[PDB]
Write a protein that binds this ligand. Structure first.
Ligand SMILES: Nc1ncnc2c1ncn2[C@@H]1O[C@H](COP(=O)(O)OP(=O)(O)OP(=O)(O)OP(=O)(O)OP(=O)(O)O)[C@@H](O)[C@H]1O
Length: 126
C-alpha cells in the first residue's frame, strides 16, 4: 500500500478545486508524501505543485482507498482546505478549474471522491 496526501480545496465562493488527470478523470489534487513530511504538509505541497494554488488546511477529513491501473493499492489521506487564485496545470494534467458542488458532482469520476465532497461541504465553515 502506497500512501498519498491531498486536499479538498474550496474558495470563498464555496467552489471546489478539481483537476483532470492524464486518463481524463476529474479528481482532487494529491501526491506522495516525502520522507519526513506530515501528511498535512505533503497535501498542501501537492496542491501547490499540481494546481499552483496556495492553500491553508482547515481540518482533516478521512482516507480513501483504491487500486490504481498498475495494481498498486493507494491510501490517500485528505484535508479540507481554503484557497484562492487561478489554477495552473503541471505537465500531464488535461484540465483544472474551480467548480460549484453541483458541477463537481456531475464531473468527479469516482464514488470515493463524491462522498468526500459531501463530507467536506458539511464541515466547510461559512
Ligand atoms: N477512487 C478510484 N477508484 C478507481 N480508480 C481510481 C480512483 N482514483 C484514481 N483511480 C485511477 O488511478 C489513477 C491515478 O493513479 P494514482 O495511483 O492515484 O497515482 P499517480 O500514479 O498519478 O501517483 P500520485 O500519488 O498522484 O503521484 P505524485 O503526485 O506523487 O507524482 P509522482 O509519482 O511523479 O511523484 C487514475 O488515473 C485512475 O485511473
Amino acid at each position: 500500500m502506497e500512501l498519498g496526501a491531498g486536499g479538498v480545496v474550496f474558495n470563498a465562493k464555496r467552489e471546489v478545486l478539481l483537476l483532470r488527470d492524464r486518463m481524463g478523470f476529474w479528481v482532487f489534487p494529491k501526491g506522495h508524501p516525502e520522507p519526513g513530511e506530515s501528511l498535512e504538509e505533503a497535501a498542501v505541497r501537492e496542491v501547490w505543485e499540481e494546481t499552483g494554488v496556495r492553500a491553508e488546511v482547515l481540518l482533516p477529513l478521512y482516507p480513501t482507498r483504491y487500486v490504481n491501473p498498475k495494481g498498486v493499492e493507494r491510501e490517500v489521506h485528505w484535508f479540507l482546505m481554503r484557497g484562492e487564485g487561478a489554477p495552473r496545470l503541471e505537465e500531464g494534467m488535461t484540465g483544472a478549474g474551480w467548480f460549484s458542488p453541483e458541477e463537481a458532482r456531475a464531473l468527479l469520476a469516482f464514488p470515493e471522491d463524491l462522498g468526500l465532497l459531501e463530507v467536506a461541504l458539511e464541515r466547510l465553515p461559512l
